[PDB]
Structure 1
Amino acid sequence: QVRPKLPLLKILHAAGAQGEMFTVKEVMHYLGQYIMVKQLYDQQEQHMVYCGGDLLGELLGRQSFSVKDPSPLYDMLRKNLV
């Protein structure tokens, strides 16, 4: 089981998660939710996430990532779920 730190719960909750303990599938569904509802992906680079000045970005530290290559976010997730 995974209890994230506040900041990511923050993206997390904000995509309608509830609570503190979680799974990794679950942590991946809400971050997807978030990107989809925040509509953060690129209308023309459909796999590219643009989260400049957006709290994901904050948490990832990049302004962009590709989902076709998800590493930098794993290193977010490798970093953030206790």
Structure 2
Amino acid sequence: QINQVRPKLPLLKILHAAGAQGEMFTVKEVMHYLGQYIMVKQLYDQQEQHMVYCGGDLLGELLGRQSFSVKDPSPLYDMLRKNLVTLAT
């Protein structure tokens, strides 16, 4: 057993649509399922594989924006700030 926290139903949907290893994880575990989700869903640019385009996806509707970069993680962590509680203080 993991001994960690469950994100809300829409966010858990992204992670399960990716194939997550439970319903209880840390920020660093939950966000790893986004990387595998995009790699399976191939939501990145043809020109820039590290640039992500979630427009029309559940992950995009949940982000509230069609795009972010592997070099700019900020809006993911902000979508977690209010969806997911962590050990961090």
TM-score past 0.5 threshold: yes
Q: How far does residue 79 in structure 1 lie from its aligned partner after superposition?
A: 2.1
Taking the aligned partners of 1:71 and 1:47, their CA distance within structure 2 comes to 15
Taking the aligned partners of 2:16 and 2:58, their CA distance within structure 1 comes to 13
Q: Which residue of 1 aligns with 2:22?
A: 19
Q: How far does residue 22 in structure 1 lie from its aligned partner after superposition?
A: 0.9
Deviation per residue, 1:1-36 (Å, 9 max, x gap): 221000011001011014321122210211111011
TM-score for the superposition, normalised by structure 1 = 0.90
Is the partner of 1:14 in helix, strand or coil? Answer: helix
Is the partner of 1:12 in helix, strand or coil? Answer: helix
Structure 1: gaps spanning 5 or more residues = none
Q: Which of 47, 52, 59 is equivalent to 2:50?
A: 47
Is the partner of 2:68 in helix, strand or coil? Answer: strand
TM-score for the superposition, normalised by structure 2 = 0.84
Is the partner of 1:35 in helix, strand or coil? Answer: helix
Identity value in percent: 100
Q: How far does residue 65 in structure 1 lie from its aligned partner after superposition?
A: 0.8
Aligned residues: 82
| Misfit runs of 4+, over 3 Å | none
